[PDB]
Amino acid sequence: GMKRLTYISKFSRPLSGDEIEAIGRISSQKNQQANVTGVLLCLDGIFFQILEGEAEKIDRIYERILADERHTDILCLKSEVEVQERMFPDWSMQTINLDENTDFLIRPIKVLLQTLTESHRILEKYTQPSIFKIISQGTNPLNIRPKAVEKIVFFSDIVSFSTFAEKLPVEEVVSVVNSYFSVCTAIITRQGGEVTKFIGDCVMAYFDGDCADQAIQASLDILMELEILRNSAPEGSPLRVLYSGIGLAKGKVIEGNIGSELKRDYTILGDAVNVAARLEALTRQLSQALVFSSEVKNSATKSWNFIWLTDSELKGKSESIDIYSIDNEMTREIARNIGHYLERV
């Protein structure tokens, strides 16, 4: 019935040795009253901690730790559920300050610890957020059994992206794409979605199958933020001609340990390439910045201002599907305008 968690974090401000000693002594007192044990280490502005005890007590202590202003960038490396024995039975909280330790054998160990944590922080940026979520639940992501799950799938793209690449220096093109990706990822994550990959200039994301309201709201919020960005940019900025198309569909996703010894993935949506290309064509053909299928429309619970637009084909199959949008002032040739503006700047 025991839990044990291990995490790393970063100092949010310079902390002196006496403040670290005080955190350890207060933690030892509170942990003793809760029957919790463990160890706390610091090195060059990094915290490492291991906590063990009854599951409910550990969960409540950890939530408090997450709100402590004195550190940030919390990353849980390991969560062990149904723990057999305690590893630190005599330590309510033992504090080890490695900055102050001068022992002969510990010196190369400090170098090694610092190098491993820095490499870890780089790897963190290039990996999905699902893997870390699975890790915090006590599961090794390589050991998950496969499952099929219904999702709302989100695809967004940049209008006339090739014009940017043809007319601007490469450093400017990267500035534009990064501004776009930052807007999309912030809003999708705020509404409970998960960005799964970038495919060229296209953002691919998932929402739960009964969260169509959140997927529609995220789409409208992205359109609103891009209009604000276009209007508020400096004179002559390429951001003034950044436009997006968005399409939503429903699909069967497989979660599991996918890939080869060389490269792994956590999820696969078969024929994702074809669904994305068909939605891109629809936003262009209809001159509508947001389109979605009847399946998405029917999963929504709120009274959105829906409008029927046309029939299309989204899957490889030959069924004819009704396509909808939202009728509002927001959604009410761009490529020709983009080329001329970018030309004379």
- Residue 275, CB-side half-sphere exposure with 13 Å CA sphere: 22
Distance of closest approach, residue 157 Cβ to Ca ion, in angstroms: 4
Per CB under 8 A, does 173 bind a second copy? yes
List residues forming the annotated binding site. Answer: 30-31, 49, 64, 68, 70, 157-158, 160-162, 201, 270-271, 274, 280, 284, 311, 322
What is the nearest approach in angstroms of a second copy to the Cβ of residue 292? 18
Residue 325 is a binding residue for ligand FAD (CB under 6 A): no
Candidate list 54, 80, 221, 322; residue touching Ca ion; CB under 5 A: 322
Candidates 101, 139, 232, 285: give the one binding a second copy (CB under 8 A): 101
Q: CA 26, CA 101: separation in Å to the nearest integer? A: 22
Give the CA angle between residues 297, 300, 305 to the nearest 5°.
Answer: 65
Q: Looking at 286, 309, 315, 341, which residue binds a second copy (CB under 8 A)?
A: 315
- Residue 70 near which of Ca ion, a second copy, ligand FAD, none (CB within 5-8 Å, type-dependent): ligand FAD
From candidates 274, 285, 298, 320, binder to a second copy by CB under 8 A: 274
Could you tell me which residues are annotated as the binding site for ATP? Answer: 160-162, 270, 274, 284
Q: Applying CB under 8 A, which of residues 22, 26, 165, 334 lies at the interface with a second copy?
A: 165
Integer Cα distance of 306 and 220 in angstroms: 13
Amino acid letter, residue 10:
K
Q: Please tell me the distance from the alpha carbon of residue 36 to that of residue 27, in angstroms, as a whole number.
A: 10
49 binds ligand FAD (CB under 6 A): yes
Q: 283-322 as b/e, with b when 16 or more CB fall inside 10 Å?
A: bbebebbbbbbebbbebbeeebeeeebeebebeeeeeebe
Q: Do 146 and 255 touch, CB atoms closer than 8 A?
A: yes
Please give the Cα distance from 219 to 190 (Å, whole number): 12
Examine residue 117 and tell whether it contacts a second copy (CB under 8 A).
yes
Does position 52 interact with Ca ion (CB under 5 A)? The reply is no
Write out the residues near Ca ion by the rule CB under 5 A.
157, 161, 201, 271, 311, 322
